[PDB]
């Protein structure tokens, strides 16, 4: 399927690569400041309706990176010294280039990005930031109706711009038709998933790249006591993935 990739061009360093729950959060708060809670409700409805945003991922110029699907971790076996060494390095890699991502989905051979377009500095005194390489930033995907992108996602992203500046392009990801799918977003699962890495925030999220079988994820609204019922985004951004038997 084809999607809208929101590209964040940074005006200096970033604290973290924002993931879907904190992206929706940021967009939610931005909409409440522009169009009141009425619009936030129309946004949650649109998203519950079938609309999805991915977590943020690195881009370097004209290269779109995507999370390594956990589908491959078991199948890596499918020279001893080369085999052990390669397997560990592929295991360690957290991202694959789009070209190679589309391969890993079909359990065909693929290669890793050599240098990743960011490096976590940690200035002491301590805490750390993220230094972005030249013409390298972060992006996230939106699948849904355009009138929801134009009405909410787009204006919110500009508002949040004012540390970064925003442009968006059309993007295509060839993904095999399958019973199984990868999430491109951290998700609060409904059903027990196939393969996953947990993520602690308190909430228990499945990480990006984790594999689910027909699981849309869910949203959660809770009364913190902050006067407006806050929504936590936990919907799955599914792309079909071929699996090895076992």
């Amino acid at each position: 399927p084809k999607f809208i990739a929101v590209k964040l061009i940074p005006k200096g360093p970033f604290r973290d690569i924002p993931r879907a729950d904190t992206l929706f959060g940021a967009i939610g708060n931005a909409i409440s400041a522009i169009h009141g809670q009425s619009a936030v409700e129309e946004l949650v409805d649109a998203f519950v309706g079938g609309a999805r945003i991915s977590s943020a991922f690195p881009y370097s110029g004209d290269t779109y990176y995507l999370p390594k699907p956990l589908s491959v971790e078991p199948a890596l076996e499918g020279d001893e010294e080369e085999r052990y060494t390669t397997a560990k390095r592929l295991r360690k890699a957290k991202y694959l280039d789009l070209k190679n991502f589309e391969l890993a989905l079909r359990l065909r051979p693929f290669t890793i990005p050599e240098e990743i377009p960011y490096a976590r500095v940690d200035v002491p005194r301590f805490w750390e930031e993220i230094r972005f390489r030249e013409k390298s930033g972060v992006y996230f995907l939106y699948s849904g109706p355009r009138e929801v992108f134009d009405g909410y996602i787009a204006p919110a992203m500009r508002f949040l711009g004012d540390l970064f500046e925003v442009e968006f392009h059309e993007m295509k990801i060839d993904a095999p038709g399958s019973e199984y799918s990868v999430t491109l977003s951290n998700a609060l699962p409904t059903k027990t998933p196939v393969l996953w890495r947990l993520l602690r925030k308190r909430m228990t999220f499945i990480a990006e790249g984790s594999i689910v079988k027909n699981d849309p994820g869910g949203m959660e609204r809770l009364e913190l006591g902050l006067s407006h019922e806050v929504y936590v985004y936990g919907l799955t951004f599914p792309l079909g993935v071929e699996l090895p038997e076992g």
Binding site: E73, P74, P189, T192, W196, R197, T204, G246
Partner: protein, 706 residues
Amino acid sequence: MEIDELTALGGLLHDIGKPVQRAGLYSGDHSTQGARFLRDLAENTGRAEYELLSLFSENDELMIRRIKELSPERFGLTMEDVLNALWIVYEADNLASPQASRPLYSVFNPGKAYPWAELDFEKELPVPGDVFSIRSQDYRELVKRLWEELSKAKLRSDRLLPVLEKYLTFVSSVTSEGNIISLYDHMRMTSAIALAMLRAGCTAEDGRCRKEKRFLLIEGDFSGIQDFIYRVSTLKYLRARSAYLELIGWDVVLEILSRLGLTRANVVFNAGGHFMIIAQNTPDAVKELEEIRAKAVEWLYREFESDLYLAIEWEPVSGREFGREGNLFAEARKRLKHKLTVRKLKRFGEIKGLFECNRLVSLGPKLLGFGRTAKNDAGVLVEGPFSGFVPYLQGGRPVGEQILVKNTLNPGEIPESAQFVPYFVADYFKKDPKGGVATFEELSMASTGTRRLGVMKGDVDRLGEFFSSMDSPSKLATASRFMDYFFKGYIGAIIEGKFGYIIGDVPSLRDWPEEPDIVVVYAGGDAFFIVGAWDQIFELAFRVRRAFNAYTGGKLTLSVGLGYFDERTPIYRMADVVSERLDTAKDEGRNRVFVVGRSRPLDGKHKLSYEWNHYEELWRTYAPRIYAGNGRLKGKLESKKGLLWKLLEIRELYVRDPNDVRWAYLTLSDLFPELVGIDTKAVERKEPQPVYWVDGVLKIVLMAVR
């Protein structure tokens, strides 16, 4: 006695004939000669049970009559039972699977062999050297000590293993050329396999157990260990976290053995958070494993909220697969490994409801071990998934169905009913003026020159392959133990300053002290994390790597990451940085140390890491010309400390551009003749200039002089 205890002791003593043959004595073959040793022993002291256990070393005509003469009723055993116990133990000897003087050839290097000695961590480093005949005296001394211990031993497998481990550890199980298997290891892996076959219920089978999946390989591996230990909220506390992980692991293993009615012989290995057990494949077992696996994870989840997970898996395996046909065993281990990797991508899947610190301060000197009791018990200082752990002090009494006793193979004064579980741990620590362990502050203050804490992480290179190349359980057992024991056993000794002849002449800044400013955080399996005064930690890395070179046949290699931090750096960052530096030494090829952080050209030709031999040679070359020792520069360079600093700023104008020839233009001039000239072989070999390497020496010297 009972059929289960008999079969265990039966496999465990089958081949005790070997050492008595080698020492002379009964003049028979090892089979007949082993019978005469236990029968003679039985008669001495007057414990008939040994005469029953003597039948194992030997058309079933005589056998039935010889058994019949020995009253089976006296030990509450059936005659028909004992025939099973013998046949079972017979096959068990074949599955775990010639002059007299031939010693044990190293698992690390079959070319070299071990000089006879009993296992003693205090009494010297096992160094596989030249092949020497072991005298028919050394074995006579062995058998008499062995006979004396077996006399006073309580005849349970937990009290028999430690004396077999003491004496038969450095003994060739078979006296052929390039035989790698310790006898102790073959004996415990025959006790292990035998008991399995009994629990599997298979009997009178001369191949129903052999060519049928009547065994289970149980591999248990903890994950996220790094986060559990080094990423929470002091050294006292961080030591206890590492110790808590040891007890937790034991609590699971012992529970598994308890509920499957197996003995500690069935623990193929238990090192660095990784354990393997051989067991029966009864539906009763897999049920008891599914029950255990679940109740452990649930507890580990409740207690640490996903920081620490235990991935347990098991595979149905047959007698065929414990040996080679045309290496099945390794391939049965691979199919089990893959099962585990899959389970580690399903962390806490055993909890359906997943998708809906004073006791460690008082646990962080004076104790001998721990008592594995029920949770609801007085004095329980820490608790694991299945059992509370009651600290066992010098003057106190041990409490619990199992007692875990630290850094000995001798039960000592513990009750006759209590199961003896020995455990070794590397826990060396520099004592304060107060009886308590030194602090990051006290350690950093001790260092020569600069006041920095020293941190070294150290792993063994391509262990997965080394273990994968093991034919048989007994081989894997001899491999694991010798590996684990280097770190658990001898790192303590290495820190004390022992084995000077084996590891002499390694880079050093000061004279090696009597009470070194070092604290081991962990030292087990194939890895170690140690902190201390930065200059003492720097030297220790080279000492440890040299000892390990000797302890192996120079056939295995370490990689080390070193770190020199401000004492006020958090534990979690120091760990993350030395971790980053370690897997960097591995990535840049293996068998190399990350000595100190370094600027370099990012042209993919320049390695931050040094090969151990490269650096060791660089230090031998330059250090003696510039450094006098114990924090003092050479008298010639007092009033010239800058000539060093100028080479660092010179190397920087090589880092800026390693093609720019300005560093030639810039270059007493006698001092450092290697660097001044433009190297050429390096330009052809596509390698760095000597200039690139020197900083590794100088920066360390300048830290020691400030």
